[PDB]
C-alpha cells in the first residue's frame, strides 16, 4: 500500500530527493534516513543518536533528539503526518 505525507513531511522527503506525493512506508523510511545523512543530523561519535532540534525535522517530531535504537518518536510523527 501507499501513503500521502502531509506538507512539512513531504518537504523533508523532497529535500532528500524524493519525487511526487505518494510513497510506500518503506520509501518514506528510506528518504527520512537520506534526509538525516544529507543534513548531517546524526552524532559523529554515537551514530545512532539523531540531533534534530535545530531542524524542521525536530519541529515535526516535537523533540530535540532521538535514537535509531528506539524509533517510537518516528512512528508517532508518521501517524500524525501520513494521510492514508
Amino acid at each position: 500500500n501507499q501513503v500521502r505525507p502531509k506538507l512539512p513531511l513531504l518537504k523533508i522527503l523532497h529535500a532528500a530527493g524524493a519525487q511526487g506525493e505518494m510513497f510506500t512506508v518503506k520509501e518514506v523510511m528510506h528518504y527520512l534516513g537520506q534526509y538525516i545523512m544529507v543534513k548531517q543530523l546524526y552524532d559523529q561519535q554515537e551514530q545512532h543518536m539523531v540531533y534534530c532540534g535545530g531542524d524542521l525535522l525536530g519541529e515535526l517530531l516535537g523533540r530535540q533528539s532521538f535514537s535509531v535504537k528506539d524509533p517510537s518518536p518516528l512512528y508517532d510523527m508518521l501517524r500524525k503526518n501520513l494521510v492514508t
Binding site: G33, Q47, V50, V68
Partner: peptide, 11 residues
Amino acid sequence: TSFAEYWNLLS
C-alpha cells in the same frame, strides 16, 4: 556501526 548501518535496523 555507522548511522547508515543503524538506519538499516528500521523495518
